[PDB]
Paper text:
Protein N-glycosylation requires a lipid-linked oligosaccharide (LLO) that acts as a glycan donor of the transfer reaction. Among the various glycosyltransferases (GTs) involved in this process, PglH stands out because it is a membrane-associated enzyme that catalyzes a well-controlled, processive reaction. PglH exhibits the protein fold described for GT-B GTs, consisting of two Rossman-like domains connected by a linker region. To understand the structural basis of such a counting mechanism, we combine structural studies and molecular dynamics simulations with synthetic, chemo-enzymatic, and enzymological studies, and uncover a mechanism by which PglH controls the number of successive glycan transfer reactions using a structural element that not only attaches the protein to the membrane surface, but also contains residues that interact with the pyrophosphate group of the LLO during elongation of the glycan moiety.
The structure of a binary complex with the donor substrate UDP-GalNAc was determined at 2.3 Å resolution, whereas the structures of ternary complexes including synthetic acceptor LLO and either UDP or UDP-CH2-GalNAc were determined at 2.8 Å and 3.3 Å, respectively. The structure of PglH bound to UDP-GalNAc revealed the molecular details of the interactions with the donor substrate. The uridine moiety is positioned in a pocket formed by α12 and the loop connecting α10 and α11. The 2’ and 3’ hydroxyl groups of the ribose moiety form hydrogen bonds with E275, which is part of the conserved EX7E motif along with E267, which interacts with the N-acetyl group of GalNAc. The pyrophosphate moiety interacts via hydrogen bonds with R191, K196, and T271. The GalNAc unit is located in the cleft formed between the N- and C-terminal domains. Unlike in some structural studies of GT-B enzymes, the saccharide moieties were clearly visible not only for the non-hydrolyzable UDP-CH2-GalNAc, but also for the functional UDP-GalNAc. The 6’ hydroxyl of GalNAc forms a hydrogen bond with the side chain of H118. The structure can explain the specificity of PglH for GalNAc over GlcNAc: whereas the axial hydroxyl group at C4 of GalNAc can be accommodated by the enzyme, an equatorial hydroxyl group (present in GlcNAc) would generate a steric clash with the main chain carbonyl oxygen of L269.
Numbering used by the authors: 1 to 360
The structure:
């Protein structure tokens, strides 16, 4: 039997949740009828298959006080309309604020709703949103989480919670026996905000051996609020870092790069620590709040440092850059994890969850 699956997401931007949704939609869209409802107009940053149907809600004004109030109500009822008129067998929403909007908008309708979390629960800070999450999430039909820790957190007040790892689209594009001729290249890939902490990357570079700073390229791929302030820090520290902005061909960076650094305080299941597995990129990561050891076995397939510890990051960087055989050992061991994120097995566990929710 074919199922009509409608995803709901705020935008189809470059974020990691969007990357996961597009991979899921593309995998499901040939056997099943897949549609996406998004709150804002625009073309998908990630390439979406032609069978996936995309609709955007109507856009509204938010410039005057009247419109700042009336358009919030119009936006909610535009979503309720799109759900009413949808002939989906199941709704699947992405990201907490969107999950909450879908739970409220779906009140009284009968299509079941699966909500999907794409961060650690601790990432949501304001007490009012944590309250709304606490009171609305019990009314979903199922919740997908990214780690066992968030599973136990949510399971306390949500009936059906399932741990679903994210599929990586590189698992179907890069052959497992690929060889790479690496350059003296170090990457930071991610949004430039406080949580991602790119300043830790810059400070670590300034502490590297002269010998390394002059013979290595350090690349920041991504954009965000902190872009301008980071370029000043680069000047003030007297280092050479190349800001590429937001790049569409991250594959070319991964192919040439020896090392990637993640400096976040809080992550769900960081995509760059998965994508690196398929290109023999050595992973150095802060011990972001809670899931880091689920992706890196320290000194076996990668290296962990304390949060906000730019000195430790520099030493770990020097440890693999001054010892290529040790770096090669880490990335060889990391290859055993490539099978954990194949699209095929994760797609079927989503289909199992959809069937379990449709049969209740
Ligand atoms: C703070 C947080 O919880 N973030 C979570 C959120 O991911 P994020 O929203 O924080 O983004 P991410 O870092 O996990 O991935 C961003 C993605 O876009 C990429 N990219 C980046 C720069 C660029 O120039 N070009 C480009 O394509 C990239 O290679 C990638 O797949 O959702 C993910 C999937 O659930 C993970 O759970 C993340 O941990
Ligand atoms: Cl992003
Ligand atoms: Cl007004
Ligand atoms: K970005
Ligand atoms: Na995201
Ligand atoms: Na990431």
């Amino acid at each position: 039997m074919m199922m009509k699956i409608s995803f709901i997401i705020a935008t189809l931007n470059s974020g990691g949740a969007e990357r996961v949704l597009v991979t899921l939609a593309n995998a499901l869209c040939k056997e099943h009828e897949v549609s996406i409802i998004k709150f804002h107009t625009g073309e998908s940053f990630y390439k979406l298959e032609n069978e996936v149907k995309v609709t955007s809600l109507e856009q509204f004004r938010f410039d005057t006080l009247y419109h700042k109030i009336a358009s919030r109500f119009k936006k909610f009822f535009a979503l309720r309309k799109a759900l009413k008129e949808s002939k989906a067998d199941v709704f699947i929403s992405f990201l907490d604020t969107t999950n909450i909007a879908c739970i409220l908008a779906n009140i009284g309708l009968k299509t079941p709703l699966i909500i999907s979390e794409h961060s650690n629960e601790a990432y949501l800070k304001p007490k009012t949103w944590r309250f709304l999450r606490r009171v609305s999430y019990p009314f979903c039909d199922a919740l997908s989480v990214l780690g066992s820790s968030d599973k136990v957190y949510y399971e306390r007040f949500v009936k059906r919670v399932k741990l679903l790892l994210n599929p990586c689209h590189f698992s179907d594009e890069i052959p497992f026996d690929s060889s790479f001729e690496k350059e003296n290249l170090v990457l930071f890939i991610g949004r430039l905000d406080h949580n991602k902490n790119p300043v830790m990357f810059l400070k670590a570079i300034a502490h590297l051996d002269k010998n390394l700073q002059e013979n290595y390229k350090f690349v920041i791929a991504g954009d965000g609020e902190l872009r301008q302030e980071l370029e000043y820090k680069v000047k003030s520290l007297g280092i050479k870092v190349d800001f590429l902005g937001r790049v569409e061909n991250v594959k070319a960076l991964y192919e040439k790069a020896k090392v990637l650094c993640l400096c976040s305080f809080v992550e769900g299941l960081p995509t760059v620590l998965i994508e690196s597995l398929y290109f023999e990129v050595c992973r150095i990561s802060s011990s972001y709040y809670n899931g880091a050891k689920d992706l890196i076995k320290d000194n076996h397939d990668g290296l962990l440092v304390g949060c906000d510890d730019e000195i430790a990051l520099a030493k770990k960087l020097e440890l693999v850059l001054n010892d290529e055989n040790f770096r090669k050992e880490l990335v060889n061991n990391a290859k055993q994890r490539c099978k954990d994120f194949e699209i095929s097995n994760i797609k079927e566990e989503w289909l199992k969850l959809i069937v379990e929710v449709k049969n209740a």
